[PDB]
Amino acid sequence: AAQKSFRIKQKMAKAKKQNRPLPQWIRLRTNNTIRYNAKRRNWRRTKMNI
Amino acid sequence: ANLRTQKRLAASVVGVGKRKVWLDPNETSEIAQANSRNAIRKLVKNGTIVKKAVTVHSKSRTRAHAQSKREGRHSGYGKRKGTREARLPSQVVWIRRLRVLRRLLAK
Amino acid sequence: GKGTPSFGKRHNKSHTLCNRCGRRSFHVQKKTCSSCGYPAAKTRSYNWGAKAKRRHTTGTGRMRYLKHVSRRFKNGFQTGSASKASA
RNA sequence: AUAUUGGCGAGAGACCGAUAGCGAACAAGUACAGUGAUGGAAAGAUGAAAAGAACUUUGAAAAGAGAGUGAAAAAGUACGU
RNA sequence: AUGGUGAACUAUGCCUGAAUAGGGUGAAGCCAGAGGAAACUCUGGUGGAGGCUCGUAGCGGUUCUGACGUGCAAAUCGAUCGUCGAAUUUGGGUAUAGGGGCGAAAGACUAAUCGAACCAUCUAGUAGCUGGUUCCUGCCGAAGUUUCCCUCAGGAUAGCAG
RNA sequence: CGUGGAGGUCAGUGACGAAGCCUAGACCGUAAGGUCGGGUCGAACGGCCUCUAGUGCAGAUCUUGGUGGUAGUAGCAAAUAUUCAAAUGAGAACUUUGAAGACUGAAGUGGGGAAAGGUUCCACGUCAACAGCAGUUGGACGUGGGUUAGUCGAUCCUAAGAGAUGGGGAAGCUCCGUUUCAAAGGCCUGAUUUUAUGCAGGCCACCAUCGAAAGGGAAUCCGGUUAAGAUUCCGGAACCUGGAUAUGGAUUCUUCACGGUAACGUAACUGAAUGUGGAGACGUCGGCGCGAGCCCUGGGAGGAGUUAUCUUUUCUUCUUAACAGCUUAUCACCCCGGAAUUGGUUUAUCCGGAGAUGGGGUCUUAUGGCUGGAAGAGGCCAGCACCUUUGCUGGCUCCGGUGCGCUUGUGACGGCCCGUGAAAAUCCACAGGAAGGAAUAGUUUUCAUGCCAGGUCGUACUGAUAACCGCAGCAGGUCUCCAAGGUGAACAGCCUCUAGUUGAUAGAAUAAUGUAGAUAAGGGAAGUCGGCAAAAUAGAUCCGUAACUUCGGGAUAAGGAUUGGCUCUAAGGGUCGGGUAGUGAGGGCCUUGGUCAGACGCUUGUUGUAGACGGCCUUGGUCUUGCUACAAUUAACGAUCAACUUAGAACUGGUACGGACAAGGGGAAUCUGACUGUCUAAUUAAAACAUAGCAUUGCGAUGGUCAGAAAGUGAUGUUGACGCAAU
RNA sequence: CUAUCUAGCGAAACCACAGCCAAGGGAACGGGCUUGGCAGAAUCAGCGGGGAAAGAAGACCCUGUUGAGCUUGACUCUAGU
RNA sequence: GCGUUGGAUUGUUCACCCACUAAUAGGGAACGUGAGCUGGGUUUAGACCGUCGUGAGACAGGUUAGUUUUACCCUACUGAU
RNA sequence: UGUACAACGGGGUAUUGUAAGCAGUAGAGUAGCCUUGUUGUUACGAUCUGCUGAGAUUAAGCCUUUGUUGUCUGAUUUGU
């Protein structure tokens, strides 16, 4: 919100790091049952609510 | 080739808006190579991007039209849509009348 | 309009992040978090809500101290160092 | 000597078998909805072993037809039956 | 019934700021002139008042009972409308909370819900009242009648039946 | 009969193949069902004697999941818009570029933000999915980059209010109050030379904390630079605060300054406790004066446009910041002087013996002017050639005018009130006199200069008929600054310049019935519950206007006459000048000589150029004047300048003229509420509520009304009968 | 501008099964029962009679020994005084 | 077989008048006809007056204001292949 | 391959209402000037007149046409 606060920004910086797909190596791991990033967050469909 | 970025950049370096920047299509081969303001800047001096000089808004009728009114034309009852006070308030006419009486007596 | 046209007049915030649990239940005007309670000296947990208590009891975090307490008593709260037996 | 669906450590059953059994056999108090107290799911089984398809051809490719792998792909990852 | 949450919507008060083209009408006060003996009275200028007025921005919405009415829309669009410098419109902070708040009152508003909020627990609340009530074959096989009951869309007793 | 499991048994069946599933193939039983054959398929299962139960299915507007007909149908129709060519691409009504045609028309479909969103910002590559058509395009996908602060804000103060102590309640979670029944604090001088900082006195008493990134607030701007940043980065130029130290100046044996009669001034020109004063600090409306930005416009220096004909034509550049020196206004005040024959004076009538008019000065410095910053900056143009990285040489960047013009700021005012329209931090000043001080120098760090530091947090983008909220990219809602030209009263409607879009599925005929615009001969409300919808007048100027009344209104009542264009007429202002002859300056003194700053400019010197043709003196023809004269005055005149407003006269147009837009139907009455106003936000805007007015009631606080579970608790009450409370 | 046709996209409401009538009886105004009339693919655009069409286990009336709001010389209590 | 009207009042069924005309006859079809229209009346909720009730409220009382939705199905009908 | 057809053009019919340009001692008049006038012309001047009873349009569902140019064989289907 332009004139933000560090508490809010520290949370947004956390969101940016976790807004990524799986690196390809994950799918090749032994006994892997994970195929997609179920925690994906986008700015259109869902809101963070800080 | 997508030239949207170049049109945006050319607008800022020249100063005028995007409606007065001219990026010809005959040599568009190297326009897309310009991915920087310095690259666009040399594209202006050589003659690639002309300034597309401003559209004329000539107030020639108005100067003649206002000339007619100053002569005493278009001053009839059918040329007026407001009361005689909206056009020229009686207060101003009174103020213009006092301030010349006050100074004349003082003079 | 009590419906859609009145849902666009809401751009303020009533609650905000709770400095103690971070659940965004800290009422601004009331200055009291509605989920745990702050800056009250006690975390609110009512017996009429059992799912809510189950969401914040021991086991939902890390247990930075109690994961070792069972192990520490598992031997008898020894202190010092270890000896050399063989190999 | 008495009680103890909480905590730890164990042994069991004419119990349930994954639309059942705890809400959750799975990154389950998770995603998500609500300004809030709160509410809250869906999701198991390719094959013994990826050996998960070299290479030929068509197509811009996605893919198809062959070939090949594999007992078997009427097992090819949108994969037991 | 118990215990908690809610005035970011709207209801009211306070603190703090912000917004309201252009015309009409014309009050005091003032100036000059005229009349008359006085009392005083008329004429002509300013003057801008006035919870006034025509009318944009804004706020509501009267009518077409128009459009739509599985819509752009859980109430919107178009025309026609009332008001528009004030018991005006509104931002932010704050205060008032459930049989309690607030109400220029309409039982109106209280975050699509209110002549009585939302959430969780008691709670699988109680129902003489509707609905459903999951395989075959064989044998027997009825009643809507007596008496009593605040009893007559129900029971108990006797009867019919196995 | 059948289903999930348990005990026993058939040494039961079985990957040369169980279970499960399919099978208008066969057999048995009346039936519940059981057996076999074939295909599919790969790990367990069956018969019998018993036991056990979460044991049977068609529906309970039954739970979960899935799929149908409807159906390839309804529909993808508001916001006046599209077309051609090339490029890319396998694949263009939609991507890009170019050329047209339009729209928003500057209360934007433009530029920035508050809340909100959180990387949507920018670059590369890319189309499985989303963009209800498509798509090599994207606010989508994968990978990366980007937010720079002593000055902008948060930080600090306090408002309405929240709330911790001491206390008092409450079994208690906690409630009351927050300065009240609390002995609640640090602070300058001196001691110094173990005193580190204690100690001996002068002292003051406030009395937690939080609470408004549009309330108060110490200090900065310009040029330029990224793919995305800037008042933050580069360059240049500032100012503020905290601190340390000197240099320079003033002060002084009249030891802590002078001048002016005075308002006051001079860069400095001692000074504590305590007290006082000012700023912060501030209602709304109306007109007037002045300033800035913009608008209009003349001359000149350049560029671009038209040029069948005409136009000394049209458009465009000509700009100057924060900060600093000098200077500048109303208002206000000071010295002389003294007033009626009362006078000054604003658009708006206030002032004057509590002392005017007049003459002379002081002050605040908003604003404005010259200069420095700063023309080496930016802008408009000509030559040079660099696949390039790019620059050099260069010219101008100048002088004006007007205005009820719009926006805005400010000043002196006037109107309004039973509303007279915030606090504190902070900063400064005055009274006071403690304390210290001279020249052999002591102060002076609120005089000039010099030195150092300014910590943390935010800075990207949207801010909306695609970035926020309405399940969605939903015609809804959301606070604010800037805003041009013309017609026109106008921020009205209509067209355009800057800027931005050209976006919301398309192609062809374009049946009915529709939605939205319209037009209809004669009559005319005969229609309908009701002229409901449409229609007419509807701008401006002149004439004229009744019943009634609370005398203010009704009333633009009702009802009549004109409106275009060309050529004219008249009226409405500003600024300057009220003489001749001799005389002094003709404070321009140009002109003739040069005297010598007459010099730069066109590494010493060669010798070449102008002296900038200018300080300094002239024998001079060189339109302001003090003196005398005629006699000085009337009539008033003459010269320049640039605005619109009003009225009138002829002519003219197939009698058209508010020619588009814009824009009141009117009158006689009746019922009822006095009026302005308010409510059933989503079917009732009303004669309903409210309002002023009137009347009644309670109450003199050890009280009246009301709250609380108590309280050493509160609301009225920061109140007092002309008040509060209930009607 | 739709409606119409075409290129692309592409639901919902509703659905015992389906859809030609007269008369009769019938739960006494059924498309299907009976008796007669009649009946020839596939369909397209309108239309509105009907399917007692759709939307909600009628907001009217009654019953229930079902409630709620309000009122009072109903009954029983109660904070306050 | 054919024709049975135009108007004032009332929401009006009804009724009474004006007038023409040859005449202004009675009726049924879910008291024909609202997915044909209108909403004038009765019929939710606002409000006023009179009577009744101590009151909240009651009245064929009188009066004013009061969102009326969907066919993109089958049949029937109107046209077409 | 036809006095065929089509597109232009021509003529007719019709709507319309008298243009573009030049010229005019037409023009309410307004002012400069020079030989200063017995129309003095220059500049402006709504409008009017003469060619202009013209100009424009004339078929998309008007009529005719020997004139110029151009076209005349693509696909599918059918038997007792």
CB C37 within 8 A of CB C56: no
Q: How far is CA B67 from CA B77, B82, C26, in A?
A: 19, 22, 72
B87-100 residues labelled b (16+ CB within 10 A) or e (exposed)? eeeeeeeeeeeeee
Rounded to 5°, angle at Cα A17 from A11 and A23: 155
- Residue A28, chain C, CB below 8 Å: the answer is no
- Residue A7, chain C, CB below 8 Å: the answer is yes
Resolution (A): 3.2
Integer Cα distance of A4 and B33 in angstroms: 39
- Residue A50, chain C, CB below 8 Å: the answer is yes
Positive or negative, the CA dihedral C83, C84, C86, C87 is positive
For residue B25, whether the previous peptide bond is cis, meaning omega lies within 30 degrees of 0, is no
Integer Cα distance of C13 and A8 in angstroms: 14
Residues of chain C positioned with their CB less than 8 A from the CB of A7: 17
Q: Does C24 contact A49 at a Cβ distance shorter than 8 Å?
A: yes
CB A49 within 8 A of CB A11: no
Question: Strand E closer than 7 Å to the CB of C27?
Answer: yes
Q: Which residues pair with C16 in a beta bridge?
A: C26
Integer Cα distance of B47 and B42 in angstroms: 9
Integer Cα distance of C22 and C30 in angstroms: 17
CB C17 within 8 A of CB C26: yes
Task: Please compute Rg for chain B using Cα positions.
Answer: 28
Annotated binding residue C14: no
Integer Cα distance of B65 and B59 in angstroms: 10
Integer Cα distance of A50 and B22 in angstroms: 46
Q: How far is CA B40 from CA B37, C11, C18, in A?
A: 5, 43, 52
How far is C-alpha C77 from the geometric centre of its chain's CA atoms?
29
Mutate to test the interface with A, among C10, C13, C17, C28 (most CBs of A within 10 A): C17
**Residue type, position C44, single letter:** R
Integer Cα distance of C47 and C57 in angstroms: 13
Rounded to 5°, angle at Cα A31 from A26 and A34: 45
CA-nearest of B27, B26, B51, B36 to B6 is B36
| φ/ψ of residue A43, rounded to 5 | -80, -10
Integer Cα distance of B39 and C28 in angstroms: 53
Pair of tokens at residue B55? 């559209």
Q: What is the DSSP letter of C7?
A: S
CB C56 within 8 A of CB C45: yes
C47: nearest nucleotide, CA–C1' criterion: E121
- Through-space separation of residue A26 CA and nucleotide D66 C1' in angstroms: 34
Way the structure was solved: cryo-EM
CA-nearest of A48, A49, A41 to A18 is A41
Question: Pairing state of beta strands C26-27 and C15-16?
Answer: antiparallel
Question: Strand F closer than 7 Å to the CB of B23?
Answer: yes
Q: What is the largest CA-CA distance in chain B?
A: 82
Residues 6+ positions from B41 with CB-CB distance below 8 Å: B13
Pair of tokens at residue B84? 């005689």
Residue labelled with tokens 């920004």: A9
B15-32 residues labelled b (16+ CB within 10 A) or e (exposed)? eeeeebbebeeeeeeebe
Q: Does C17 contact A49 at a Cβ distance shorter than 8 Å?
A: no
Integer Cα distance of B63 and A38 in angstroms: 71
Integer Cα distance of B14 and C68 in angstroms: 70
Question: Strand F closer than 7 Å to the CB of B50?
Answer: no
